[PDB]
Symmetry: C4
């Protein structure tokens, strides 16, 4: 009904960054990921791999003590802020980060919202997903706030029932991005990327291989990394959603859509990303 | 002697499900796996990988605290019900699952049977394997009960000695599926899939590469996942047994039958499944 | 000086076993591996992978509590006898095994020799390696005892200095196999396989890619598995040593000899073994 | 301005060692790596893999108790000196090593400098990286001391600000190698390898795929291993830096430069090294 344009291959090619010969890890920044809890530890690994695969310089993972050891053998490149997501509830961050994500595998609690409020006082883009998504408002700040709800989380945020939401996805996503003054990545087939300045796009990539636990955790990480290597954070969000879906399309060329595991999207991204360079 | 028909490539092709563009993980359900104990932890990873590879939406693994960390780095997509198989002995499940499996790597104890009795009060298909297999009867309930004995476990269930069983496999499997009113997947070369309504099939795939620890644990998981994406639970069971054996046949094209490890069946399934689409 | 014959490709092809369609894991037996200690845990994983890759039915790993979790994510198919190598020092094994190995990554202590003495009362082939190798004698028993010393361990066993040993390898290996009434696999370039009945062979495969920590741990496991699927335990030993070296030769076709890691021999064996079928 | 020559493909080919048929792990020595701490554990795995991939015989990793289990499943070939880097602060090493590295993932503390002072009393080449880099002087000793600073660490060592350093990299690196009487590998695009005898080279390989956490940790390990298989420790340093960068160039043929993870350099080295033989 709205004619929201697709973010196309041509837009991706035109906007993906270079990685210059004269750069070091500091050029691409240090990200922070606040993710993973004792009965949902895997979401931290998924998002971690997503982020380190996606062109950042360094990654600090703020997760519980019990989760740390489960990440290290698979993602040895990350370092840790021990019990970081709980510690973020107590004070403003003393360290400076290029971008921050919070929520995958975190309980949807008031302590998590406190950590959200502290993270928002930093001057960098911030992603809120999963356990960090709630019905709330957002303080005026410099850097973008990026919310990544699936339709269930959108219902939690807005009170718009899922059955109604799904009939008018882009209309609701635009309306709430504007009201909240946040980016909203409203997930699903034809994911909507709605910006608080009124720009809105649809994502043309992805398939049912993504309809399985963990794929959104991986996406949150991909957005986190891309925010560190793109000059324009809009392009980071758009390219992460696009390339995330493109990795699922590569998988289905020679593998059944029923059989993808989320972490494999990260394994596939190196070759898919190269295609768009 | 009986002319039990084979479930053939043509039957598999005709019955494997689609994964629609307009679906999400909830479309394919949340399964529960109750598996893994302190000296047999690996069976939980094997069955977990089997299940997540096999087209479910989400997987919760109910296993002991000591087993959880051993699964997460390999299968980060699963979440946990901490000490779940022990907790299931104490009360009906409060959560709703699309399908449930119990038994791989569990001790063959009365506490495990209590957990079985509680799981059976849910309205979903239930698989019982390994430590959950015992001589018993089953309450009338809506969803199918699927027993996956090898010949030793069948002897434990029925008192039919293995030497006698193996002379008349389909006859015994049919007789006991009918008596018990359960599906029986009687494993071995030419696995028998006997339904309590009298339908019975033989499986034509598989080889001696499967004659090694863990392959039945992986199968239980494959059945669990397929029950979540097939509309007809009969087809889920049949296709899981078939594709399980087909992965062993792919392996032996270029690898010795002596050298397969069970977890690799799960790694092979993506490409094998695609062949049948 | 002696004309000890090489165990050749033709001997390997003539002696490798079939894996029949009508077999199950019990056909190929349950092996026991007593290996791994707190500061040398990896040797248990190396030998475990070697063994499960090499055609056994099941593998029980008797290792310390702290080592168990380090094996499970990589080799989920093994089960455990918790603190098994220490417990073996206290009594004869109550369980029956198709073959047993002891020593990789175990401290060279009197407690380990006690565990050796208990294992020797079983009726199955037994391999002694590494920490289980000492200067001693062996009781008359039914099954073969297989010692796998490198030249340093041979010096420890016999008092023959390494410099002298290495001038007359097959002569010393034969002499001591006869004296001890054990098989001796005297490792090195042109490994000597000396039988206590006077048969003796040289191994023609392998290269300097093997000259790195862990490769002998992997070999001990390969011998353990092959003893379970070969009818003649002589052929098991000969084929394990041969195929172990052949995997290093495959590696060097496209990879530098400086860069092999022991666990990769196990990864390579599936395709190498197939070549000899 | 200086015409520092590049260490070229031809120099690498002329200087890489053979791995003779008549060698064993002892021929290539035992290295010691003192690396990894509770919130930076991964650096020990990265450097460990680097080292074992790079032609040593054995590797002992001296790291904290909590780090050990995180390494073993990925690098089972290493053994451990439990809490080794802390224990090295208390006394001269009783064991003899072919080469030693210290610092990746270690806190930059006085206790680490004490461990440095003890390691320096050994007669072998010693690498100091990361947490072991400080403003200090070095005792006259037989074996080379090899410092591997990035420009930030060089500033910490010398007081030369990074902005000034980067205008005259080889001039500063030569000056300080001479003053300190240490090798300095001054990292960055066109890494400078400055020897205390006045030889100096530039490295022509590498790209922005390396501009991400962990790649320097992997390099320290590669240098450690190469010091064990090269007769001339100068060639070890030069070839490690060259081949490290070459692995990043192989990656970018078919993968985006944004997406490399440090541990993958180690995975790539087997095939890259073979190219130069
Ligand atoms: N491996 C892990 O550690 C995992 C952790 N996860 C975490 O589990 C927590 C809960 O998130 P979940 O998303 O699993 O569960 P939720 O219960 O929050 O949301 C799922 C529900 O949202 C609705 N929904 C979602 N997508 C929809 C669509 N396209 N159309 C219509 N309705 C839709 C449905 O009502 C569905 O039942 C989060 O913290 C998440 O990060 C999940 O990602 C699963 C994997
Ligand atoms: N990695 C792990 O954690 C593993 C766990 N496992 C668990 O170990 C427990 C015991 O199960 P097992 O099956 O190992 O041992 P069992 O002792 O229960 O059954 C094996 C016996 O059954 C008979 N049998 C099985 N298949 C046969 C056939 N085709 N023909 C004739 N006789 C046959 C034989 O008597 C054989 O000795 C289960 O909980 C199982 O899930 C096993 O799957 C081994 C791997
Ligand atoms: N990843 C792990 O957990 C590892 C554990 N390992 C364990 O470490 C223990 C000690 O065994 P090691 O072999 O490392 O050390 P040892 O000190 O027992 O033996 C090595 C010595 O034997 C001699 N030697 C060996 N091969 C020779 C040859 N071809 N020619 C001449 N001399 C030769 C040399 O004197 C050499 O220094 C064992 O329990 C072993 O299983 C080792 O395999 C290293 C890897
Ligand atoms: N996975 C892990 O366990 C990791 C551990 N690491 C450890 O973290 C510790 C701190 O080392 P880091 O290097 O991360 O952080 P540092 O804060 O010590 O050094 C980074 C700073 O040095 C400067 N710098 C570095 N390279 C430069 C170049 N080419 N041009 C200009 N300026 C440059 C910049 O000021 C930059 O902010 C070390 O012990 C290191 O081994 C890091 O390697 C990150 C990964
Ligand atoms: N059928 C589908 N087609 C395209 N994308 C999908 C489909 N199912 C799920 N996804 C994507 O998978 C992710 C699910 O996120 P989450 O539910 O948070 O794990 C989102 O990026 C979705 O847009
Ligand atoms: N020789 C064989 N041919 C075909 N399938 C086999 C063979 N040996 C074992 N299997 C299969 O491997 C699995 C063994 O299950 P379990 O004993 O529970 O681990 C079952 O699915 C068997 O049907
Ligand atoms: N240069 C070489 N050529 C052939 N085999 C080797 C060589 N170096 C080591 N090996 C083999 O590697 C293993 C070393 O055993 P160990 O020292 O116990 O780890 C043995 O099987 C040796 O025969
Ligand atoms: N843009 C680049 N080109 C070449 N090498 C690089 C580049 N960025 C980083 N490196 C290398 O990556 C490593 C970084 O080390 P560190 O900062 O200690 O992790 C060094 O070996 C650098 O020389
Ligand atoms: Mg989500
Ligand atoms: Mg079973
Ligand atoms: Mg050895
Ligand atoms: Mg560094």
């Amino acid at each position: 009904a709205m004619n929201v344009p697709f973010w196309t291959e041509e837009h991706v090619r035109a906007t993906l960054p270079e990685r210059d010969a004269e750069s070091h890890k500091g050029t691409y920044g240090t990200a922070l990921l606040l993710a993973g809890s004792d009965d949902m530890p895997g979401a931290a690994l998924l998002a971690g791999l997503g982020a380190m695969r996606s062109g950042l310089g360094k990654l600090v993972i703020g997760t519980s003590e019990n989760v740390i050891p489960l990440i290290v053998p698979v993602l040895p490149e990350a370092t840790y802020w021990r019990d970081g997501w709980k510690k973020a509830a107590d004070a403003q961050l003393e360290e400076t980060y290029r971008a921050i994500a919070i929520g995958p595998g975190l309980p949807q609690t008031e302590s998590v919202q406190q950590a959200v409020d502290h993270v928002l006082t930093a001057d960098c883009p911030v992603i809120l997903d999963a356990g960090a998504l709630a019905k709330r408002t957002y303080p005026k700040r410099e850097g973008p706030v990026i919310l990544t709800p699936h339709p269930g989380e959108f219902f939690r945020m807005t009170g718009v029932p899922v059955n109604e939401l799904q009939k008018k996805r882009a209309e609701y996503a635009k309306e709430w991005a504007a009201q909240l003054q946040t980016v909203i990545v409203l997930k699903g087939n034809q994911t909507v990327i709605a910006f608080p300045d009124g720009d809105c796009w649809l994502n043309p990539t992805g398939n049912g291989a993504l309809a399985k636990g963990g794929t959104g955790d991986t996406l949150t990480g991909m957005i986190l990394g891309m925010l560190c290597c793109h000059e324009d954070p809009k392009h980071a969000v758009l390219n992460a959603v696009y390339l995330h879906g493109a990795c699922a399309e590569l998988w289905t060329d020679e593998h059944s859509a029923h059989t993808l595991l989320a972490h494999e999207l990260s394994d596939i991204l190196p070759r898919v990303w190269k295609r768009f360079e």
